[PDB]
Amino acid sequence: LGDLPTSGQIRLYDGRTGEQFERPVTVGYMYMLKLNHLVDDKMHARST
Amino acid sequence: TEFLKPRLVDIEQVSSTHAKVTLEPLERGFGHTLGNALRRILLSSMPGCAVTEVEIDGVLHEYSTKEGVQEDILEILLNLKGLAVRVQGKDEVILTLNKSGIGPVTAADITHDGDVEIVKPQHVICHLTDENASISMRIKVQRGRGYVPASTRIHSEEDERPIGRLLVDACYSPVERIAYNVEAARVEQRTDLDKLVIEMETNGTIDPEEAIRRAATILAEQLEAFVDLR
Amino acid sequence: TEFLKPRLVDIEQVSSTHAKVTLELERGFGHTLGNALRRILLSSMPGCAVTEVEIDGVLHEYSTKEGVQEDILEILLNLKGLAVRVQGKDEVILTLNKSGIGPVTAADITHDGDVEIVKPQHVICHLTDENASISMRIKVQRGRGYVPASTRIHSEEDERPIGRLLVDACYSPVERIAYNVEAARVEQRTDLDKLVIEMETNGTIDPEEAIRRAATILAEQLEAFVD
Amino acid sequence: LSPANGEPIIVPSQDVVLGLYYMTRDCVNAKGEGMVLTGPKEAERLYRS
Amino acid sequence: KRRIQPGDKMAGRHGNKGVISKINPIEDMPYDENGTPVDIVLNPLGVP
Amino acid sequence: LDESGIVYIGAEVTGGDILVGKVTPKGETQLTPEEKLLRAIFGEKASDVKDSSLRVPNGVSGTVIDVQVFTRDGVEKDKRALEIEEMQLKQAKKDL
Secondary structure, three states: OOOOOOOOEEEEEEEOOOOOOOOOOOOOOOOOOOOOHHHOOEEEEEEE | OOOOOOOOOEEOOOOOEEEEEEOOOOOOHHHHHHHHHHHHHHHHHEEEOOOOOOOOOOOOOOOOOOOOOOOOOEEEEEEHOOOOOEEEOOOOOEEEEEEEEEEEEEEHHHHHHEEEOOOOOOOOEEEEEOOOOOOEEEEEEEEOEEEEEEEHOOOOOOOOOOOEEEOOOEOOOEEEEEEEEEOOOOOOOOOOEEEEEEEEEEEOOOOOHHHHHHHHHHHHHHHHHHHHOO | OOOOOOOOOOEEEEEEEEEEEEEEOOOOHHHHHHHHHHHHHHOOOOEEEEEEEEOOOOOOOOOOOOEEEHHHHHHHHHHOOOEOOOOOOOOEEEEEEOOEEEEEEEEHHHOOOOOOOOOOOOEEEOOOOOOOOEEEEEEEEEEEOOOHHHHHOOOOOOOOOOOOEEEEEEEEEEOEEEEEEEEEOOOOOEEEEEEEEEEOOOOOHHHHHHHHHHHHHHHHOOOOOOO | OOOOOOOOOOOOHHHHHHHHHHHHHOOOOOOOOOOOOOOHHHHHHHHHH | OOOOOOOOEEOOOOEEEEEEEOOOHHHHOOOOOOOOEOOOOOOOOOOO | OOOOOOOOOOOEEOHHHHHEEEEEEEOEEEOOOHHHHHHHHHOOOOOEEEOOOEEOOOOOEOOOOOOOOOOOOOOOHHHHHHHHHHHHHHHHHHHH
16 A cells, blocks of 8 residues: 555665665564663773 | 767756756766765765854743743744754854744744845744733754764853753754666767666755765865875 | 865885885875775776686586696686786787696796786796696786676676686775874874875886876865855 | 683683684685685685676 | 763664664665654664 | 743753852852962952752753642742642642
């Protein structure tokens, strides 16, 4: 219905060189979360 | 030797923000090289104008509200971050806005300036919901390139700022999407040629031909070091 | 409108055919320059190369001769690796004549005036019998890049003379080109690039001249838009 | 080397193994089959182009 | 305000978690035929 | 700092900045004669109070968005708490 491939895989190109990747790559949308483990609160150092 | 040099041929203009360009004479293999180089340069180094500072009457910090305004100060700053402005003749200008009554506050309400053009007048900034509500802003617009976070501009400073001046992250680049394609040319003398078609997506404020020429100039200026004796 | 300018701080010169060049760059420009330079150096450099050969008594690549230990496939492989620079026309035919016992070198090819041989130590065949001998007609055209023999035999719609042997043509004087992008810093500007290029070429030219030729080709290709 | 058994402790895994395995596979009717090359440098030059 | 940086933890709803390792420039990301790039690249090796 | 010794609302602060000013009695002290002579030469006087202000901890930045002042019933309120309670009374007055 959305005019999209039925396999869920498309062709991609390398941004740094423009060359095509040799095999199709699964591309889509997934829901991502940011957890309460921040490196701002975990980095620590002590001299004296 | 037998190198048919490219030349800008046709520039279609699909919309105010969508355009296509073509370079017809290309030897075998040059199309992809120039397409990739131009795509990277266009996506990386185009100049533009963006909002960097906002001052609102009776507002001390961005984590606050205003009576008669449906949006928070943070949402207003985010809306102002997406304002497209074209400035000619100077690298810094200060705009002013004043509005009253019940209704939306769009980019058309900004006070007219001689050498400042607003590309999209329908860009909604905020909404007023009270008959006695009023707003007044002083918006500072600069020119630059790249992405400069405000948390980095605070570091590069030697004089204090007064309370009430709100900093905004600047996204100077006016180009969102770049796509290029290589197709065979129609030169009857040489049937081994091809043409390069470049598709551009912008927010206005930039001419496609000028962008292409600036990218080519940057690439040539970079190659000047390789060309020389060392 | 102002950008950082590179400078060839180091040019490590290892041999007459191998060198390393480093440039110490705006963020993302190292790949942009390196990929373009590599593509131009590979698929666009012009030169002269052996393209075909005629051997008496040899009908096709499956045939077998006598008096030489190397098979004709080895002879074609050695011919493909011969580097020749020509000052003059676009097509020269060379002759080779050697009889007896010993290794026939490139110097045994008759000195055909303008045509020059850069490596007289190249080996073409080995002579094992005094009675047997080899006589061949080697032709050298001019062109750019690399052209496989498969597309040429597919492009030979006209009649092929009997006994014609096609050898792959390596016009470009490049053997190996590779580039690497590293990280560089100046006065706490961290997100900067340092480009390193490894270059290998046959004795036709020096690596620096090839790099300059590629850069000049690209710059002249871009001359129609630079304002 | 591992001090318990003497075997090497640094072993490539995951992406490196997959990359090398895909590098060193063969196909029956791949493009460019049948050529004779002067050396690995010519093979790399052919692949990159 | 805290912005994302290498060392922060991200995760999905299927038990797939990871640490951000690099912020990539937009021109270095893989892109499709129409030129629109991808936002996040994940290792397919984890799934099987 | 304001006239009451409290940082303004909306100020941008970093590590080491003073938020609330406070002083404490210090009492007797012992000083070496050389340092005492240096102090006398420089002309600065001796004080009976010691700084005990509330400072921003190191590694912490941010913007001041709210200040709360609590006072004892017997103690009389200062100006800034008065302003806060006027704001609260204004909100209640509008609601009614």
